[PDB]
Design a protein around this nucleic acid. Structure first.
Ligand SMILES: [Mg+2]
Ligand SMILES: [Mg+2]
Ligand SMILES: [Mg+2]
Ligand SMILES: [Mg+2]
Ligand SMILES: [Mg+2]
Ligand SMILES: [Mg+2]
Ligand SMILES: [Mg+2]
Ligand SMILES: [Mg+2]
Ligand SMILES: [Mg+2]
Ligand SMILES: [Mg+2]
Ligand SMILES: [Mg+2]
Ligand SMILES: [Mg+2]
Ligand SMILES: [Mg+2]
Ligand SMILES: [Mg+2]
Ligand SMILES: [Mg+2]
Ligand SMILES: [Mg+2]
Ligand SMILES: [Mg+2]
Ligand SMILES: [Mg+2]
Ligand SMILES: [Mg+2]
Ligand SMILES: [Mg+2]
Ligand SMILES: [Mg+2]
Ligand SMILES: [Mg+2]
Ligand SMILES: [Mg+2]
Ligand SMILES: [Mg+2]
Ligand SMILES: [Mg+2]
Ligand SMILES: [Mg+2]
Ligand SMILES: [Mg+2]
Ligand SMILES: [Mg+2]
Ligand SMILES: [Mg+2]
Ligand SMILES: [Mg+2]
Ligand SMILES: [Mg+2]
Ligand SMILES: [Mg+2]
Ligand SMILES: [Mg+2]
Ligand SMILES: [Mg+2]
Ligand SMILES: [Mg+2]
Ligand SMILES: [Mg+2]
Ligand SMILES: [Mg+2]
Lengths: 100, 262, 30, 151, 205
RNA sequence: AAACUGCGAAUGGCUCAUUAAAUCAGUUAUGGUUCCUUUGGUCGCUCGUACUUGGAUAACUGUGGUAAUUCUAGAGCUAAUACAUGCCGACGGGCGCUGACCCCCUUCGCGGGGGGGAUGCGUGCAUUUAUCAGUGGUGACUCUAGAUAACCUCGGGCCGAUCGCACGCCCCCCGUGGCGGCGACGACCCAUUCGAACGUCUGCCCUAUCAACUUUCGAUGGUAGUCGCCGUGCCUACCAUGGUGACCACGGGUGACGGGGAAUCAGGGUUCGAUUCCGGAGAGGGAGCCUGAGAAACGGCUACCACAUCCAAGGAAGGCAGCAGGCGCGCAAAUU
RNA sequence: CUCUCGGCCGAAGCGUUUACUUUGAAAAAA
C-alpha cells in the first residue's frame, strides 16, 4: 500500500491534492504536514501532490499481504513487546473477562 | 485598550489608603469582589500598612497561605481581596476581631470589636425583585442575594445578617429620626440623625442629616447608610463618635493633649 | 432547604397579610 | 382609510383588534381601544392623543419611546419634514478676558407627534431626551406653548 | 470587511469628516441570510460574547397562531405572496419578517372540527369519509352534548376565512426574523388587516 | 523529565505620525447592549452498562526526505476534566384539557341541576410566536411575576460517566453491603465586581486673496425590512424635499494628540504643554482575517506596495515608535 | 403663596419665567 513519500526537495505528500507537482495550501489545525504553534494559527505551506511520479526522493510502502517467502530483514524478526491496555474495559475485552 | 486592565499606578490609587509616593511605581489593584475598587480596602494594605504585621508583600502571602485570616467568617487566601464597609475580619491565631468602619476623616479605621459582635453585620438593601415561581429576592450593598425576605423590607433599608447562617435577624426602616452614616462624598464618615428627605423625580434625592452637636449637612440618598433606630446605633462606633471637628478645635485638642503630656 | 424556606415564608406572609388587613379594617371601622 | 397610506399595514402593536364577538356587539360600534401612557415628570397627556386615531411609533404618548435625560426648551423655526421640526436655542457665551458675553445659537431637529396640532413658527416648545430616533434626532416634543401674540 | 459604523457618514451640516481610527471588530457586519423555501437548512454563527445566532438558509415549516381562536399549530409554508419592503423579495420567494405567506389549513380545520363539531372547508357535494363522520356525528351523552350544543352558539367564522379554508390555504404574516433565530413564526391574517392585504395583492396583479 | 489538557499571552513598555465638535474635559443616559474572572443565589422543581459506555492520538520505541527553518512523513504501543455517547434514581403523584361510564337532588315524565370517574395528550428552567388577567417596583414599561395554545434549530441550551484528604455509624448482615464529613474542578441562568461600546448639554488655534455648501455614488426626514451585542441612512426598497450658513457654514493651514499642568506675572494678561498621571491613536503603508469573554492583535496569520536576509537557484525566512547597541540625520541627547 | 384631601404640618399646584447674587450637592491623584 502506498502511504506517502517525499519529493527531491523534501516536501511531503498530501492525500487531498490531485497533482503531479507542488502546491501552496493554507493549513490549520487538523491538517497533516502542519503543526500549529498558537491556538487558531494558520500558515501557508508548500505540499507535494498525491499522484506518484518519478520525481520522488523517497516513497513509503506498507506490506498488507505476505508472499511465499519472507524477507530476511522484514518478516522473520520476532515481534517486540509493547504496552498493555490501561482502561479496565479494554482489559476485559482483551482477556475476555466477565463482570465477576 | 483591547481588554480589561490588570495594573494600578501608585499615584492613581485611592487616597484613603494613604500610600507614599517613593515606595514603588505600582499599587495593589483590588480583585473583583463584593465591593468596588474605589470603595474597598485590599487585604495586603490592611495587613502590612495598618496592622504592621508584615513588612513586605511576601510576608502577607506567607500569613494568608496559613489560612489565618477570615473575612465574614470565611477563609480568604487572596491578598488583594476587596474588603469594604461593615465587614468583619477575624484572626483566630491572635484572637482579634475588627470591623471596617470609616472614621471622621473618610478613611477605614482599625476598629477592634468584641467576638460576640463579630457574629453579625449590617447591610443596606439595594434591590428588591420577584423571581421565578413568584419568589421575592433581596440584594444588598455587598452583593448578597437573600430569598424570601420580610414583606415590609424595601429599598434603602438596613438588615442585620448573622454571618454564620447568612439570614436576616431584624431590620431598620428608612425614616426621619433614625441614625445614619455617610459612605461617600464630602461628608464621608459622619454620623447623624435624618431630618428630612428631598425628592427629585428623574434625578438624585437629597437627605439632610444633623449630628449630636447640632451641625447640619446634606448628602445624596445613595451615600446614606442607616446604622441604628433613633439615636442608638446597632454597631460599635470608633473613637470619634462621627462628629467632625474643625481645624481650629483639632489644633486646640492637640495642644491640650501636648500640655498634659509629661 | 427549599421545602423549609417555602413553609417559613408561607407562615410569615400569612402573618403579614393578616396584620395589614386587620389594620385596614380598624382604620375603616373607626 | 386615511390612516392606511403606506405599503404595510399601520397598527398599534400592543392592541389586538381581531377579537371575535357576538353579532349584537358588532352592530354597536367598531371602536378600537386606544393605547396610551403617562410619560411622567408632571406632563399631561393631550386629549388628541387619547381620542385620536393616528399611528406613530415614535410618539411619546402612544408609541414605543422612553423619556429620560435632559428636558430642554426651544422656539419653532421650521416645519417642513414629516413629523419632525427644527427649533432654535439661543444663549450667551461668556468671554473671561473682556468680562462680556456673545450671542450664540444651536439648532435641534426634534420629533413632533400628530397629537400636537396648530403648532406655528415662533412658539415655545418643551422637549425631552430619548434614544436616537434617526441620524440627527434625539429629542421628542413634550409640550407646546403659544407665542405672546395669541388672540 | 462589512462595517456599520457612523464615521464614514457626512456631518449634519454636510461636510465630510476625516476618520481617526481604522475599522474595529465590534463594528462589523455580515452578509444577509436570504431565506428560501425548501428542506430545512440552518447554519449557526458565533457572535459577540460567545453566543450563537441561528442563520436559517432554508425553511419549510413553522408554527402559526389563529389569534381569534387562540389555536397555535405547526404548518408548512407554501408560497410568498406580498412583501411591503420590496417586490423583488416576492419574486425570489424570500422569507423575512412581516412578509405575507400562504400556509396549509389542515391542522386548523382538524381543531375546528374537533372542537365545535361542525363542518368546515367541505364542498357542497357532501362527500364524506367514515372517520370524519364519526368525528362529527359521534355518540355523546346528555352532559357532553349539552356542552357541544352550547359551543355551537359561538361557532361562526367570517366569509373571507371560510373561503380561504375552502381553498385549502390561509394567508399569514411572519413575526419572527428567520435570519436571526432560525425559525419562521407568525400569525394568521384576519379582520381589517386581511382586507388591506387582499386589496394590496389584487392591486399588485 | 517529556508530552496531551487548562490558563495567560488583548496587561505592561514605547512613540506622537494621523486627528480641529474629531480627540478630550466637566455633566448626564443606557427604561437601547455585551461582559473572562471574583462574590452571592439556583443546580432531586421535568413523570419519560449505570458498581462507570466508545473510538482514537501524543510523549516512547523504530524507518526516513530536503543545502537550508521552532519543516515534518510512514510504521508499532498506550491515557483523560482532550474527543464523543448515554442511563438509573427522586417517581408516590399533582395540575390542565379529552372523557366512556356510575351516583345524588327536582320533575308524573321530558327537562333543570350537583358530584365521582377508567382510558388518552401535555407538563420543569432557558428559546420563538400568539392570546388573557392584573405579586412587587419606577417620575414614566411593551417592567417583573402569573395563565393559556404551540414551537424548541443534528453547524444540537441546562438537568455532574471528573479529582483529593480523613475515614467512620447501621441492618432479619457478613452482602451487589447500606449510609455519611470537608474540599478541588465544571456547568445553564439571575445578581455583583472590572469594564467596554453607543448616546445628551456646553467648551478649541490662524485663515474671506475660502461665501454659499450637501443631495448622480444618503445629503435631511417618513414606512417596512436586512445586518449588528443593541438604539440609528448602519445598509436596502418605496416615498417627501429636505439639512447647514456673517451668531462665519464649506474649504484651506497648523514646526495641532487633548487635559491634569509649566514659565513669566501689581491688577488684567502673554506664551508653552512630544515627555513618567488620565483618555486617544499606531506598530514601514494600506487591506482582510483565525482563535478567544475580550484583538480587525502585529515579540498572531494572509496578500498587495516599498525595502531587505540565506540559497546547492529548486526554495526558505522578515518588521527595535520594547532594553541595550549600530548606521544615517543633524546645533542637538547615556552601558550591547 | 394657595384651596382641598390626610397626620400646626404632610401631599398637590406653586412661581409668567429668566439673567444676577448668596447657599448646598457632586466634583481623580500628582
Ligand atoms: Mg497598553
Ligand atoms: Mg490583583
Ligand atoms: Mg478681565
Ligand atoms: Mg489614527
Ligand atoms: Mg501547553
Ligand atoms: Mg487568552
Ligand atoms: Mg522602560
Ligand atoms: Mg465627556
Ligand atoms: Mg443598547
Ligand atoms: Mg459574571
Ligand atoms: Mg500512529
Ligand atoms: Mg469538555
Ligand atoms: Mg410576563
Ligand atoms: Mg428600523
Ligand atoms: Mg428609516
Ligand atoms: Mg502632528
Ligand atoms: Mg498644544
Ligand atoms: Mg496676574
Ligand atoms: Mg505686568
Ligand atoms: Mg501636558
Ligand atoms: Mg501631551
Ligand atoms: Mg513633533
Ligand atoms: Mg499615556
Ligand atoms: Mg492597535
Ligand atoms: Mg514599531
Ligand atoms: Mg521604523
Ligand atoms: Mg505592515
Ligand atoms: Mg479566553
Ligand atoms: Mg495589524
Ligand atoms: Mg518588536
Ligand atoms: Mg505588543
Ligand atoms: Mg533600541
Ligand atoms: Mg533586536
Ligand atoms: Mg545635549
Ligand atoms: Mg551623536
Ligand atoms: Mg478632578
Ligand atoms: Mg487635584
Amino acid at each position: 500500500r502506498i502511504s506517502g513519500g517525499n519529493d527531491k526537495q523534501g516536501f511531503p505528500m498530501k492525500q487531498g491534492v490531485l497533482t503531479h507537482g507542488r502546491v501552496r495550501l493554507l493549513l490549520s489545525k487538523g491538517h497533516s504536514c502542519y503543526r500549529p504553534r498558537r491556538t487558531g494559527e494558520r500558515k501557508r505551506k508548500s505540499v507535494r501532490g498525491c499522484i506518484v511520479d518519478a520525481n520522488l526522493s523517497v516513497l513509503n510502502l506498507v506490506i498488507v499481504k505476505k508472499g511465499e517467502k519472507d524477507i530476511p530483514g522484514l518478516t522473520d524478526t520476532t515481534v517486540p513487546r509493547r504496552l498493555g491496555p490501561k482502561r479496565a474495559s479494554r482489559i476485559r475485552k482483551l482477556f475476555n473477562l466477565s463482570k465477576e | 485598550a483591547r481588554g480589561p486592565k490588570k495594573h494600578l499606578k501608585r499615584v492613581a490609587a485611592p487616597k484613603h489608603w494613604m500610600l507614599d509616593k517613593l515606595t514603588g511605581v505600582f499599587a495593589p489593584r483590588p480583585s473583583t469582589g463584593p465591593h468596588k475598587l474605589r470603595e474597598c480596602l485590599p487585604l495586603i494594605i490592611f495587613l502590612r500598612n495598618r496592622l504592621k504585621y508584615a513588612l513586605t508583600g511576601d510576608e502577607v502571602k506567607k500569613i494568608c497561605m496559613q489560612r489565618f485570616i477570615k473575612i465574614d467568617g470565611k477563609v480568604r487566601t487572596d491578598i488583594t481581596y476587596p474588603a469594604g464597609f461593615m465587614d468583619v475580619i477575624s484572626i483566630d491565631k491572635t484572637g482579634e476581631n475588627f470591623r471596617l468602619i470609616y472614621d471622621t476623616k473618610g478613611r477605614f479605621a482599625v476598629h477592634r470589636i468584641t467576638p460576640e459582635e463579630a457574629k453579625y453585620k449590617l447591610c443596606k438593601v439595594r434591590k428588591i425583585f420577584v423571581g421565578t415561581k413568584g419568589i421575592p429576592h433581596l440584594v444588598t450593598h455587598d452583593a448578597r442575594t437573600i430569598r424570601y425576605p420580610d414583606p415590609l423590607i424595601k429599598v434603602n433599608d438596613t438588615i442585620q445578617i448573622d454571618l454564620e447562617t447568612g439570614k436576616i435577624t431584624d431590620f431598620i426602616k428608612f425614616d426621619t429620626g433614625n441614625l445614619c452614616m455617610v459612605t461617600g462624598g464630602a461628608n464621608l464618615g459622619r454620623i447623624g440623625v435624618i431630618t428630612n428627605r428631598e425628592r427629585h423625580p428623574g434625578s438624585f434625592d437629597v437627605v439632610h442629616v444633623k449630628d449630636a452637636n447640632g451641625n447640619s449637612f446634606a448628602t445624596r440618598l445613595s451615600n446614606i447608610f442607616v446604622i441604628g433606630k433613633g439615636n442608638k446605633p446597632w454597631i460599635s462606633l470608633p473613637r470619634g463618635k462621627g462628629i467632625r471637628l474643625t481645624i481650629a478645635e483639632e489644633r486646640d485638642k492637640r495642644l491640650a493633649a501636648k500640655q498634659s503630656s509629661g | 432547604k427549599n421545602k423549609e424556606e417555602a413553609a417559613e415564608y408561607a407562615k410569615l406572609l400569612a402573618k403579614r397579610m393578616k396584620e395589614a388587613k386587620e389594620k385596614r379594617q380598624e382604620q375603616i371601622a373607626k | 382609510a386615511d390612516i392606511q397610506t403606506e405599503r404595510a399595514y399601520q397598527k398599534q402593536p400592543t392592541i389586538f383588534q381581531n377579537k371575535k364577538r357576538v353579532l349584537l356587539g358588532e352592530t354597536g360600534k367598531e371602536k378600537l381601544p386606544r393605547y396610551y401612557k403617562n410619560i411622567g415628570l408632571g406632563f399631561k397627556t393631550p386629549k388628541e392623543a387619547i381620542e385620536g386615531t393616528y399611528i406613530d411609533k415614535k410618539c411619546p404618548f402612544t408609541g414605543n419611546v422612553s423619556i429620560r435625560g435632559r428636558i430642554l426648551s426651544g422656539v419653532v423655526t421650521k416645519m417642513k419634514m414629516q413629523r419632525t421640526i427644527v427649533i432654535r436655542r439661543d444663549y450667551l457665551h461668556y468671554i473671561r478676558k473682556y468680562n462680556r458675553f456673545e450671542k450664540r445659537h444651536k439648532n435641534m431637529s426634534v420629533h413632533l407627534s400628530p397629537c400636537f396640532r396648530d403648532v406655528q413658527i415662533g412658539d415655545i416648545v418643551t422637549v425631552g431626551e430619548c434614544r436616537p430616533l434617526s441620524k440627527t434626532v434625539r429629542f421628542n416634543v413634550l409640550k407646546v406653548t403659544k407665542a405672546a401674540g395669541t388672540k | 470587511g462589512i462595517s456599520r459604523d457612523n464615521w464614514h457618514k457626512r456631518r449634519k451640516t454636510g461636510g465630510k469628516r476625516k476618520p481617526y481610527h481604522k475599522k474595529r471588530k465590534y463594528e462589523l457586519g455580515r452578509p444577509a441570510a436570504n431565506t428560501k423555501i425548501g428542506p430545512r437548512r440552518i447554519h449557526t454563527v458565533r457572535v459577540r460574547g460567545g453566543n450563537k445566532k441561528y442563520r436559517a438558509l432554508r425553511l419549510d415549516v413553522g408554527n402559526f397562531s389563529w389569534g381569534s381562536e387562540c389555536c397555535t399549530r405547526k404548518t408548512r409554508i407554501i408560497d410568498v405572496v406580498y412583501n411591503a419592503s420590496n417586490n423583488e423579495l416576492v419574486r425570489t420567494k424570500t422569507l423575512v419578517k412581516n412578509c405575507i405567506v400562504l400556509i396549509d389549513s389542515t391542522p386548523y380545520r382538524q381543531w375546528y372540527e374537533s372542537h365545535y363539531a361542525l363542518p368546515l372547508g367541505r364542498k357542497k357535494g357532501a362527500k364524506l369519509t367514515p372517520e370524519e363522520e364519526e368525528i362529527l356525528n359521534k355518540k355523546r351523552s346528555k352532559k357532553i352534548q349539552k356542552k357541544y350544543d352550547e359551543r355551537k352558539k359561538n361557532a361562526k367564522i367570517s366569509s373571507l376565512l371560510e373561503e380561504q379554508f375552502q381553498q385549502g390555504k390561509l394567508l399569514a404574516c411572519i413575526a419572527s426574523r428567520p435570519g436571526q433565530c432560525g425559525r419562521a413564526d407568525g400569525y394568521v391574517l384576519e379582520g381589517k388587516e386581511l382586507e388591506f392585504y387582499l386589496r394590496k395583492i389584487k392591486a399588485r396583479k
